[PDB]
Structures are given as C-alpha cells and as structure tokens.
C-alpha cells in the first residue's frame, strides 16, 4: 500500500483466517484434514483434501442439520460438537475416507474443548485420527452433564425456548443412538 | 522460396555460422541451394546473412539454373526435360521449377542433389564487403537482383 | 599533472565513498552564480555551453573555466548584474595515480572529475537581450580551459 516495495500478506493472512505455518505442517501428513470450526451458535466439521485449484471438501456436517435427526436442543455446546463430528465422520466413511488429521485452525488446544469433541465424534464414526485421549473431556461432559447440573442451580430455567427445564443429556444419547445406527439417511 | 548462394569462404567465419551453411547443404563458395520460407529456415538464413546472397528468383531464372547446374542424387546423368520427365513427378523443368518456387517439393524429393554448383559470376559480382543497399552483393536481393547474379553464374 | 592522463572514460565508474577514503576536496567554489534568488524563467535569454565530445573534466578544470567565465560576467555586468549562471555537473568520479614498478600498482587517490557525454550542457546562463553577447564571451573563455571543443548554444532567444 505504501509503495512499490511494500509487502502485503497473502489474503487469508490479512483476513486473519489461516495460519499458514500450521497449515503446512498439517498438509505434510498426506492425509485429509478434519477441519473443526465453531461459531457463536454453531459448530462445523469438514473433511478436506488438497486440490489443484484449492481444497476439496469430501464430506461435512453442520450443527444445524443435527435437528434433521431429532435435535430440539441448542447447537453451540459440547453434545452438539461431538454429535456433529460423528455425523461428518459417518459421511466421511461413506465417501471412502478412512483417516484424518485434526485441523483446529485458529482455535486453542484447550483440554476438553469442542474442537476435540468434534474429533472424538469423528473418531467414533470409524475414522482413524492421530489423537490423545487425556486431552478429551470426560464422557459425561460430552453428553452435556455439565449443563444439566448448571440448570440444577435453577431459580430460572437455563434455556429460554423451553426445550426442557432440567435439560437432557439423555437426548444426546438418543441422537447418538440414532447416528451410530445403520439405517440413518446420511 | 529463396535461393542461397555462398559468396564468402569459410576461413575466419564463425563455426556456428559455417555449420549452419553446411546444414543448408552448402559446402563451397558459389554453391547454391533453394530454401522454403519457414520460420525455422528464416532464422538460418538471417544467421548466414553476411556470407551469402539470397532472394526469390523468377520462374525463368530458376529454369535456366536447373537446366544448367541441377544434378542427380548420384551419377553424372545430365538433367534435362527428358531426365526430369523420366525421373520426377513433373513433365519438364518448368513443372519442377514451379513446384519448387511454390514449395510443394524439394530437389532431394525429386532425386536431385540439394545443391546447384554454380560458376563464378561472369563480369564479376558487386563485392563481398558490403550489402546490397550499399552497392555490395551480400544479403537479401530483389527478384531482379537475385536473377542478375544467378544468371551471371549460370 | 596533464589532463591527457584522465580526460578519457577508460575506467570503471569509481564513486563509492563507502569504499574509498582520502578523497581530496573539490576546487569548485560555486555551482550557482549570478542572482540565485531569482528564477531562470525570469530571463528572455538562455545560453548553454555544450560539450562536443564525451570526456572527464577534473574539478581543477571546472573551477578554472567557471571562474574565468563568471569573472567576465562580473567585470561586464557587475558584482550584482541581472543575470545568473549554472555549472550543472559535479565531479563524482574519483581519480588515481600510481606514484615500486608495476607491482601492487593500484593507485592512490589524487582527485575528482565529472563525466560529460558529448552533446550535454556543462554551463547554462540566463540573461537579458542586452548582456547576451557578454555571456557568449564568458563561454568563449570557459571552453578554452576544458579538454573538448564546445558549442555555444542559444536556447530561448529569437532576438537575432
């Protein structure tokens, strides 16, 4: 911008959306990337592969299409993230994808976080992904227990649109139950 | 189709320039060859530009030179209409001359040596130290200029 | 030392001060003469001294010619005459001299010169239609102190 000699960062760098150094180390595996992302309200998991004119998403799942299988709960929590990973994972298996490397983009590797939940979900779907068990939240938290107890400290329902009062991780179970099943229209 | 006549000897000429002439089948002073006007050949003549005289000859001129200096790929069999007719895809020299000028064939294709070994220019040439535009004999010529030279060397 | 020793451009450009030390100071006292508070546009006449050959002019020569030129313009128009003259070239080329046979010959630094391509303006004056003949005479004296032949070219001045 200042002159002929000025160096402008690559576009995805200005936009502060792509860590190119991590990207490179990621691509060095030769495997597909399980692109785990999250929004204030949603969570998205994509299986991306390298292409001539750009990346190629072979399969993917969004927390939105989770309802499509019987989900009346919010979509920005742990149970949401895990199930979304599993959904994307299952679809990945469908398209012939068998292994991946977790790409958490610009999110932090916080133990028990959602990007890791997406990963645990994707792994259960039968996908082979290099991981570390002691960095994944404990089963119960994945189910959504942590939020149930929070609702126990009631006085005012945690959720506005009455999905339920004391909330239900058992719903998480019903949905995972529905996904791990064969039938399911992926 | 341009006619190429070497007018300057090999002593002291760049080797890559001398090899170019040889690739164009000329190995002696006063030897002439006919070259198609292709981009590849164009570069070649442009490279030998200072040691040769070239240009497009007239149908008649070509015919005179062929009758007088054309030779078989091998042997001393004189080349005349009968030779041409009994040995080529043409009826006489004119047919050959025309096909050559129109780049439809080559001397080799018709069993003739690629080279026309001309005679020294009767009455001498315009000198080999200057190009045509400066009164010399080197470089590209008019169809008339080339005809004058080729005929004096018939 | 004869200018025959340095007048030609037969050596690489040698001007890098960061790699050369002991460079003698220039003898050129001023590059802008006359009334330098005024613009050259304010004059009807503009005459330049043009060098006819490419050469190198040692600073000692620029000073002598420039001096014998401006000196005349001062004696003829006054220490404040309404005119202005410029020496547009600066001696950037450092010169040497090998002053022990041809062994370790790289010379020591002895001076500076300005490279002037043929056809260039070495000097340029701006005067009024009156003092036009005085500047032409100042240049006649100047080109007598530099190597090449010169042309005294008159630019804006159709008062012939």
């Amino acid at each position: 911008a200042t002159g002929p000699r000025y160096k402008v960062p690559m576009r995805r760098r200005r936009e502060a959306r792509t860590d190119y150094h991590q990207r490179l180390r990621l691509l060095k595996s030769g495997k597909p990337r399980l692109v785990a992302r999250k929004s204030n309200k949603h969570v998205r998991a994509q299986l991306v592969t390298l292409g001539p004119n750009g990346d190629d998403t072979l399969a993917s799942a969004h927390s939105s299409d989770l309802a499509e299988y019987g989900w009346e709960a919010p979509t920005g929590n742990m149970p949401s993230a895990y199930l979304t990973g599993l959904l994307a994972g299952l679809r990945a298996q469908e398209a012939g994808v068998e292994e991946a490397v977790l790409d958490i983009g610009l999110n932090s590797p916080t133990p028990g976080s959602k990007v890791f939940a997406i990963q645990e979900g994707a792994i259960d779907a039968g996908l082979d992904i290099p991981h570390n068990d002691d960095v994944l939240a404990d089963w119960q938290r994945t189910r959504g227990a942590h939020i149930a107890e929070y609702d126990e400290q009631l006085e005012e329902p945690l959720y506005s649109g009455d999905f339920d009062a004391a909330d239900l991780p058992e719903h998480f179970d019903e949905l995972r139950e529905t996904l791990l099943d064969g039938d399911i229209e992926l | 189709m341009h006619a190429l006549v070497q007018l300057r000897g090999e002593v002291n000429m760049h080797t890559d320039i001398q090899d170019t002439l040889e690739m164009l089948n000329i190995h002696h002073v006063n030897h002439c060859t006919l070259v198609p006007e292709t981009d590849a050949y164009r570069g070649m003549v442009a490279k030998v530009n200072d040691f040769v005289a070239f240009g497009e000859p007239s149908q008649e001129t070509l015919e005179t030179v062929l009758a007088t200096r054309a030779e078989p790929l091998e042997g001393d069999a004189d080349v005349d209409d009968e030779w041409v007719a009994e040995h080529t895809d043409y009826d006489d020299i004119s047919g050959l001359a025309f096909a050559l000028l129109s780049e439809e064939t080559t001397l080799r294709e018709q069993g003739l040596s690629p080279t026309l070994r001309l005679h020294p220019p009767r009455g001498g040439h315009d000198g080999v130290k200057h190009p045509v535009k400066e009164g010399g004999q080197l470089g590209k010529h008019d169809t008339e200029g080339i005809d004058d030279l080729l005929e004096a060397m018939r | 030392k004869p200018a025959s020793m340095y007048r030609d451009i037969d050596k690489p450009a040698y001007t890098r001060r960061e790699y050369i030390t002991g460079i003698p100071g220039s003898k050129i006292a001023q590059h802008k003469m006359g009334r330098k508070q005024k613009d050259a546009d304010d004059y009807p006449v503009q005459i330049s001294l043009i060098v006819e050959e490419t050469v190198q002019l040692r600073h000692g020569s620029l000073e002598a010619s420039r001096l014998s030129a401006n000196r005349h313009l001062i004696k003829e128009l006054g220490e404040e005459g309404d005119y202005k003259m410029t020496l547009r070239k600066f001696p950037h080329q450092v010169l040497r001299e090998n002053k022990d046979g041809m062994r370790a010959a790289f010379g020591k630094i002895v001076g500076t010169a300005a490279r002037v391509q043929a056809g260039e303006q070495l000097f340029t004056a701006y005067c009024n239609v009156e003092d036009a003949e005085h500047v032409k005479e100042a240049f006649r004296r100047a080109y007598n102190k530099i190597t090449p032949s010169c042309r005294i070219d008159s630019s804006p001045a159709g008062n012939a």
Partner: protein, 140 residues
Amino acid sequence: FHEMREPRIEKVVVHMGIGHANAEDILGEITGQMPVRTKAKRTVGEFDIREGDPIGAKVTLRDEMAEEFLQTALPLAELATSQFDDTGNFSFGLDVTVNLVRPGYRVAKRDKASRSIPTKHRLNPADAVAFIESTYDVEV
C-alpha cells in the same frame, strides 16, 4: 444506533512506576485485586543495568472493579482537556489510566478474523469528555 455506540470502560490500569515493588500492597487494597510486577528493558546509567528485574507494579481493572475504583478515584483528580488522548483516553496522577471504547471493541482483540476498529467507531476526546463528565464530575 446510539446503543451500540455509547461509550464504556474497557479497563482501568492503576500502576506505580518506581525504579527498584514493596508498593504492591497499597495497590492491592485501593483496587481490590492482585497487582503485577513490572520489568524494564535496555540498560540504564542510573544504576539500572539489570534488564529483567522488578521496577514497578500495575493492576488492570475491568467491569465493576474498574467503576467502583473510579468512583472513589476520579474525585481525587482535576481532569482537563489536555489530559485526554486522541483516541478518547485519559490518565491522571501513582498513575491511573482509563481506557474507554465502544461496544464491539472485541473485533480487534479476538484471535480469529480480528480487525482494526474503523476511525468512525473509534472514540473521540470530545465524545470521551462527555461520557465521563456525564457521570460524577467536571471537564477542563
């Protein structure tokens, strides 16, 4: 339009630039939360050749902690127009700096797709003196 434009306090940073500390204790009481050590850079003739080593302390307050502090702190100063930043900030004094900004300032503080705040959304000295003065005190 005005709701997501009306100023607020991002942080109140109390700090004592000493030069060699034992002063942390008072800040810990006048503010309410733990202070932090301050290291220096570059060697200094004034017997300050040690690069990394305690020289000061500061406390950054946000939300209530910040307000509850200013309530009893602001009355201790005589604010002036000069004492204001070109960004809409002011510091008085033991130093007391007040960082003011508009709602979504996070856009420039987050890790993902962060972005610099447009000059239009940047607070102004004028818009700053107002908000503040418009709450328990006077200007110039």
